[model samples]
Target: KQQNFCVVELLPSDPEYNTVASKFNQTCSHFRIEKIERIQNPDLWNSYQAKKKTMDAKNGQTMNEKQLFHGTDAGSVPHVNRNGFNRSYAGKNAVAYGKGTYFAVNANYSANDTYSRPDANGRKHVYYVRVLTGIYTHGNHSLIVPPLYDTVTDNVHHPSLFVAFYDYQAYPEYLITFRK
Candidate 1:
């Protein structure tokens, strides 16, 4: 079922704004955040929920979900806002882990120019995405999808990076525009 999606600008007075902004500030203090917009897309949300439900039924419990960062170019921001992350854009940046969409635990990692390139206005944007990393393993460059796990990671023990194969496995929840 399709539903209208919106990109609502957040106000600093709102506690919700501060929650995400403070986390970004703590991670990438060098960059000045100009705006934080919350993404509301029922279509994507439902798709993610359905996937989560299926996974939960298989595992008999909730999966490991994380709010991670995804950096992208200005041209792709609106696309992600409207339709969530597209795996077709994989390898646009680095694919050291796997040929899938990449998410980072540390905001600064996605803040790099390689991933979050500045636009004509010198503004770069990153997304705080909700990722369902049920069971993951270290990824390989040659791998298209996980052979035996649900997701892939840069590290097995303490993963700073996560690679998601399915499109609905992640939902872009927030867009944070920043500049250095």
Candidate 2:
């Protein structure tokens, strides 16, 4: 179905709502889930699929896509919710991996105050995003894009952190609002 990138709130009584809340709470301590919503963006989803196809043809290997977490300020949440993650905003946090948008394998990592900046009302937003990590390699700060790889990670073998150079390689799937 065709759709625009819209934020559709998840009812508190919905099973998926509880699932996401518990998932977040289980890994992150003391925070309360205020709201959770699915991000509906057909264009972004198609873009991600296209990238997957390209990776599959070029690498002749399975394109590894995973749900990961991303944290950002309240000011940027609306823009990202409608347009998806932008790579130009990469350096706001540590660019140790590469000059690309960062994603966390563990929710708690993105929940850190350094990335999830709280709003004036003490609320914060962290996104559960789908990323096309594919074949990854260790990235250096100077690299703008993955070198002979589809993605970049903090460590090639043991990766908890991922970096996506292409904007469409990642899609914001869920927006989880919480309080500290």
Candidate 3:
């Protein structure tokens, strides 16, 4: 069941580190950071946990154990992650980086954290994240359109896939999510 979604590692202090080392001069030709642990002893940094599992009932308890508040079928565990750590711990790999196969990050704070918050301390602002990857007789196609105010046509589009985790710069506030 050869499964590995992704896991990236281009950090020579990675401020886009020379455009990800010039995209490995074009994919592959790689290694670094304790040699990415030499790709060993890894099982569950969740490549979808080989098929994903859990939810037997948790997070606010339920299942009528006489109007419950017990019977631990996995509920309200609060198992950390209100900045406590270890909640969906993203530590494994499945395309953690990119180079010619298809990668796209592009987070320079979304053209300056657009349309919202920051009258002042949006945390003393200072950001830069630029991950780019693309390809094939296929591509951004105007970055998957639809923003012309949902005119939803004239070129089939609705592309989405974004998952972010600065998971613990010890919580310097990093959390992003979008999928399809």
Candidate 4:
């Protein structure tokens, strides 16, 4: 199956228009906003759905369900590590607009044991990615946008990619998990 993740288009007049556009054109040049449709990977989708169903059944109640299961799952959970900015770049064209800082959630299975185990097969994992541009608070470990970029983009950068994971029966879930 294929799914379309709707992208809200912000014009200059909209309250968040300038902020949204500025982030795209400046800090995150590689990013773009548009309605995006994703073709579900049959194997992956099946696994993810099955797992989700099982989780729902086991819990016997609907709870902790975010569009992407944010803080609940291992791979998608937010964590602070020294290597968080290992891939960040600044200098040259990649000026440190947000400082030489970045945040990352584990996207691979090894990052979390629950998702990496063999028995986790046929389980589903969902993730939502968002860019946050706002005031930094040491307590919250958040990113702060300088005044220079005020109104340049919305304080909260929208999320991209609604990824779903499924386990394939014939292969080890680890294989697919690691690839994410």
Note the clash tally of each candidate.
Answer: 0, 0, 12, 8
Give per-residue CA lDDT, model 3, range 101-141, as digits (tens).
11122222221222112223231111121211111122232
TM-score of each: 0.93, 0.89, 0.18, 0.24
**Each candidate: RMSD to true structure?**
1.7, 2.5, 18.5, 17.9
Q: State the lDDT of candidate 4 residue by residue for 64-115, as single tens digits.
A: 1332112113232122111111222211112223333222232331223343
Computed on alpha carbons, the lDDT of every model, listed in order, comes to 0.85, 0.82, 0.21, 0.26
Model 4: per-residue Cα lDDT at residue 171:
12
Residue 175 of model 1 has an lDDT of 92
Clashing pairs in 2: none
- Candidate 1 Cα lDDT to native: 0.85
Regions more than 4 Å wrong, model 1: 1-4, 60-63
Residue range with the least summed lDDT across 10 consecutive positions in model 2: 85-94
Error of 2 at 101 (Å): 0.6
Cα error, candidate 2, residue 125 (Å): 0.6
TM-score comparison, 2 vs 4, better candidate:
2
lDDT of 2 at 72: 89
Between prediction 1 and prediction 4, the one with superior TM-score is 1
